[PDB]
Design a protein around this nucleic acid. Structure first.
Ligand SMILES: [Zn+2]
Ligand SMILES: [Zn+2]
Ligand SMILES: [Zn+2]
Ligand SMILES: [Zn+2]
Length: 114
DNA sequence: AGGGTCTCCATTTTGAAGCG
DNA sequence: CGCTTCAAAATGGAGACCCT
């Protein structure tokens, strides 16, 4: 197993090919948004970051009455679930039955338990 | 192959309602 | 005004996907 070179990086890899790709993430952040300065290692991310600027919401809710738009594919899926009702984050407390559909929504709930 | 891309997830970060 | 709540915006890493 190849351990990631990168000074403080704890990570380990099967093939040094996976290690090298990975290593890429600590690299110089060459891709700098001309609008505000944020920089990204890849260009894909800088492109995507642009949606912070335009406001473009490409993905839309084909639910009757909804039609809400989101800028990101994944973010849309996470909301349509408020239609499906899929609350996939079941609380852990023995005998507390609250479910959630966001691991932020659920774990801070846990905080309440304490 | 193997390098840029992109799809996709998990996560983090931000905001708006509810409500006490 | 305090939260907890629920909902959205955004980021970062893995690794699949697509070349030539
Ligand atoms: Zn590393
Ligand atoms: Zn920017
Ligand atoms: Zn919807
Ligand atoms: Zn609980």
């Amino acid at each position: 197993t190849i351990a990631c070179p990168h000074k403080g990086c704890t990570k380990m890899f099967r093939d040094n090919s996976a290690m090298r790709k990975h290593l890429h993430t600590h690299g110089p952040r060459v891709h700098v948004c001309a609008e505000c300065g944020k920089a990204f290692v890849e260009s894909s991310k800088l492109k995507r970051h642009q949606l912070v600027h335009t406001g473009e919401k490409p993905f839309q809710c084909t639910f009757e009455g909804c039609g809400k738009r989101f800028s990101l594919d994944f973010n849309l899926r996470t909301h349509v679930r408020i239609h499906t009702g899929d609350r996939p984050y079941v609380c852990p407390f023995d005998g507390c039955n609250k479910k959630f559909a966001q691991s932020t929504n659920l774990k801070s709930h846990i905080l309440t338990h304490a």
